[PDB]
Design an enzyme around this catalytic site. Structure first.
Site, PDB file in Angstrom:
ATOM      1  N   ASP A   1       0.827  -1.850   0.180  1.00 40.62           N
ATOM      2  CA  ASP A   1      -0.425   0.198   0.061  1.00 40.62           C
ATOM      3  C   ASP A   1       0.936   1.219  -0.103  1.00 40.62           C
ATOM      4  O   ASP A   1       1.115   1.587   0.900  1.00 40.62           O
ATOM      5  CB  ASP A   1      -0.514   0.345   1.576  1.00 40.62           C
ATOM      6  N   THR A   2       1.356   2.006  -1.341  1.00 37.73           N
ATOM      7  CA  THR A   2       1.918   2.962  -1.311  1.00 37.73           C
ATOM      8  C   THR A   2       1.081   4.201  -1.064  1.00 37.73           C
ATOM      9  O   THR A   2       1.857   5.483  -0.778  1.00 37.73           O
ATOM     10  CB  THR A   2       2.434   3.112  -2.597  1.00 37.73           C
ATOM     11  N   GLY A   3       0.108   4.210  -0.535  1.00 39.39           N
ATOM     12  CA  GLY A   3      -1.029   5.213   0.099  1.00 39.39           C
ATOM     13  C   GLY A   3      -0.988   5.604   1.566  1.00 39.39           C
ATOM     14  O   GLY A   3      -1.066   6.205   2.226  1.00 39.39           O
TER      15      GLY A   3
END
EC number: 3.4.23.16
Lengths: 99, 99
Positions: B25-27
């Site tokens: 999850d790059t968020g």
């Protein structure tokens, strides 16, 4: 480009003829932007995140240029803390996670 | 690997002999997991995202294997619906976004 992850992966986007910035978010199924005007009919939707659900307006077949790359797809508008580009548009630019 | 985003980018993780799965999850700034019986002291803190805020326990110096790649870093344990591998650990396995 190759984007490392030491800082948030924010990029320039163009939507509605305007330059904005948004987070490339592999954890989001779809794209959610802060309040703005978009063309066409919208539909009410609920989406869930880490803390619970929010109400958003769903717009279909919206154009977004992400770092200069064209994507067309669903865009949700609502009270997100940050503009998020989710998988539905990341796929359209050929974005991948590499390690 | 070079992981596309047509489906959720779930991968195997291993902590203490326990095999689980988690979302790349790059968020997420942080890594947020279900209860894993991590020994040792923690620090309470609040995090949030879409939908609001959750209470977590912060555990430092956790040994985790992510898709076979060994890392050490901080894990937040709390009531997330999905295990999330955030940037603090994505950097440690050399993960980048590419397009």
């Amino acid at each position: 480009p190759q984007i490392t992850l030491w800082q948030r992966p924010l990029v320039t986007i163009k939507i509605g003829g305007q330059l904005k910035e948004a987070l490339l978010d592999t954890g989001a199924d779809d794209t959610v932007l802060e309040e703005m005007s978009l063309p066409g009919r919208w539909k009410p939707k609920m989406i869930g995140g880490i803390g619970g659900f929010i109400k958003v307006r769903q717009y279909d077949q919206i154009l977004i240029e992400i770092c200069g790359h064209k994507a067309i797809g669903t865009v949700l508008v609502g009270p997100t803390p940050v503009n998020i580009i989710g998988r539905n548009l990341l796929t359209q630019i050929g974005c991948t996670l590499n390690f």
